[PDB]
A paper describes a structure:
The Hanks-type Ser/Thr protein kinase (STPK) PknG and its FHA (ForkHead-Associated) substrate OdhI (Oxoglutarate dehydrogenase Inhibitor) are at the core of a conserved signal transduction pathway that modulates central metabolism in distant actinobacteria. Both in Corynebacterium glutamicum, a soil bacterium used for the industrial production of amino acids, and in the pathogen Mycobacterium tuberculosis, PknG modulates the 2-oxoglutarate dehydrogenase activity in the Krebs cycle by controlling the phosphorylation status of the regulator OdhI (called GarA in the genus Mycobacterium). PknG has a unique modular organization characterized by the presence of a highly flexible N-terminal region containing all known autophosphorylation sites and a C-terminal domain composed of tetratricopeptide repeats (TPRs) flanking the kinase catalytic core. To investigate the conservation of mechanisms involved in the regulation of PknG, we studied the kinase isoform from C. glutamicum (CgPknG), which is devoid of an Rdx domain.
To investigate the structural basis of the regulation of a PknG isoform lacking an Rdx domain, we solved a high-resolution crystal structure of CgPknG in complex with the nonhydrolyzable ATP analog AMP-PNP. The final atomic model contains two copies of CgPknG within the asymmetric unit, encompassing residues 123 to 799 and 125 to 798, respectively, including a short fragment of the N-terminal region, the kinase catalytic core and the TPR domain. In addition, mFo–DFc sigma-A-weighted electron density maps clearly revealed the bound nucleotide and two Mg(II) atoms at the active site of each CgPknG molecule. Notably, even though we used full-length CgPknG in our crystallization assays, we found no evidence for residues 1 to 122 in electron density maps. Edman degradation experiments revealed that the N-terminal residue of crystallized CgPknG was Val123, suggesting that the kinase N-terminal segment was partially degraded during crystal growth and that, as similarly reported for MtbPknG, it is probably unstructured in most of its length. The absence of extensive protein-protein interactions in the crystal structure suggests that the protein is monomeric in solution, in agreement with analytical ultracentrifugation data. CgPknG and MtbPknG share the same overall fold and topology, except for the absence of a regulatory Rdx domain in CgPknG that leads to a more accessible active site. Also similar to MtbPknG, most functionally important and conserved motifs in the active site of CgPknG exhibit conformations compatible with a standard eukaryotic protein kinase active state, and the activation loop is stabilized in an open and extended conformation, permissive for substrate binding in the absence of phosphorylation. Nevertheless, CgPknG residue Glu222 is found away from the catalytic Lys205, pointing out of the active site due to an outward conformation of the helix αC, as previously reported for MtbPknG.
Residue numbers in the entry: 123 to 461, 467 to 799
Write the structure that this text describes.
Amino acid sequence: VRRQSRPVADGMVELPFITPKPEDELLIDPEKKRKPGVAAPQLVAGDIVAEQYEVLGVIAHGGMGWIYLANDRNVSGRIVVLKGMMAQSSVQDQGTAEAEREFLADITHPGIVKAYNFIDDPRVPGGFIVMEYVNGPSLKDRCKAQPDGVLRVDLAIGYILELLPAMDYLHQRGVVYNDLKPENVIATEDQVKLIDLGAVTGIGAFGYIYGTKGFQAPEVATHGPSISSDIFTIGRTLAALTMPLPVEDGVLAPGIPSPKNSPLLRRHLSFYRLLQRATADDPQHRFRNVSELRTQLYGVLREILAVRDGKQYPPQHSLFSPQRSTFGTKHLVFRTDRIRQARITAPEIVSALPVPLIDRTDPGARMLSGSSYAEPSETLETLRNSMEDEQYRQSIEIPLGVVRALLDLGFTTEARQWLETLEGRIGDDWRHKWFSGITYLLLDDYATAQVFFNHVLTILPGEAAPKLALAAVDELILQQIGAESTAYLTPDIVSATATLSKDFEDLDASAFESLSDTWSHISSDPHVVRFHSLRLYALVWATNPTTVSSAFGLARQLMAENQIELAVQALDKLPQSSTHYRMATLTTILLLVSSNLSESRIRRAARRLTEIPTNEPRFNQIKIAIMSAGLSWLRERKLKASASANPLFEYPFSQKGLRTGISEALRIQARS
Ligand SMILES: [Mg+2]
Ligand SMILES: [Mg+2]
């Protein structure tokens, strides 16, 4: 059943159909490019092994030696692989040694190669594992088939997602794969298969673990294999598929490269964050299981496709609710009201930010269903009498439900103290870090909130909520120091950062001197705070068109960098179908006359206002703001009038004409 390319990851990626090689083109010539030191094959076509396998030839040479292909004489037409198999300790109990091999044979999953036998031929010392022949190229071959030696990042994530069910099948049975790397992942027809069955061991197994240096976790040699060490190899494999990693004597250098030295990671920083967490040095700081990694891969893939292709998908696997409100959308427009500085507030940001979804596995989950609609004073009491029950001693939803009730009652200081009490037991949980960031944000301790929200983003690199929270906290830091009009970045960096395009890749590493090697979000340097707020708003806006708070936030950061043209372009993408469209149109008009005045910007602002119906209540006050800009620009330039005799609105664009026009408009305003 030969087919077409197949959709994976909710249709966000299509994996190609790989046609299997004809069965008369599978064997390799052993004499073609004979490497140094490798001996000739001991077996040749026609040799019978264990009176059941008729050798046909060799298909590869690897660490375990030559890999033979053979007919299985007990299943008509079946071809099998004979591969060198690792011996055991030769001292363990005999039953235990047989039981481990009988467990490899019983493993049954369509994403894992089947093992048929374990034999020892006297012409080949070391014994064979007999396994299914998988007709297809390895993921390593697919990379070498590309001119730059790497797979496109979204395709590589699709392949990783396809092998995760096989990894989880092993993990749930108490065994780990150990040797995941591109060369033992084969893409055949429409499926992805793991082939290195002989490396599978139990979780925490004594003995030499046959991993690969450059992919194996650092604690395996001393502490043994674990589910966390398999997660590590998944991150290393994903890194190897997507970028040319530095190699030291045939071994991949440890660590994930800095985004200062990687165009791919520079363009997709959440992909960088995900690789960091999967390959963290401390196993405690890694994804706990495959499903945990799977959830963030979907969010990171969404941000990859939005940044690169402009494709927007709805969030389907988020750990957060959607946005609950908006913030800062009326910020710039309300300042022109007549009726003393309006500012974006912390409670306004918190009311807009999402809340974590309730975990259904928590025992106290039933106690919290209905906490949003109920009176917070009652919820606090009901959740407190629940903590008097031993069955809820280990609950996390109930104690954090108390925190929310305290924050909903305005008892912010008691909420901070109660979070401190829970630090010892549940401080590691990202939901504790999230509400710690919320609480300190409400206390106006923006530096501490930045630390907690960065911790959340580190744990959940694919989620939009911590990025918007970080972007808002960074904007509040800049607002605290009065930097909403100060520029800190060069026009080249701002232009590249605001669009998240290839220009962000063309910049040299010297442009990011103020950033740490890992582009850490924790900083009080206004240069770094402005860079992160600008970039995070841009990413959220490009990824989620409904999160309009990021569109206005992006325009605000662009305005401070004197990039009015890009700020206008950002808000012009808000569709006419949105209820915030009128606000966005008025905001772009005011952006044109907010700073760095020029005749072109003033005239464009006026012509845009003229497209707005006179029905708009703020029409006249916007018109005054534009005419006031024209007069201010004429006086700063020492110009009597503009070169053109074309009027500004109905008045001459002159110092005398606009003074009259402003006075006339002010009197229409004063009588209203
Ligand atoms: Mg056949
Ligand atoms: Mg291996």
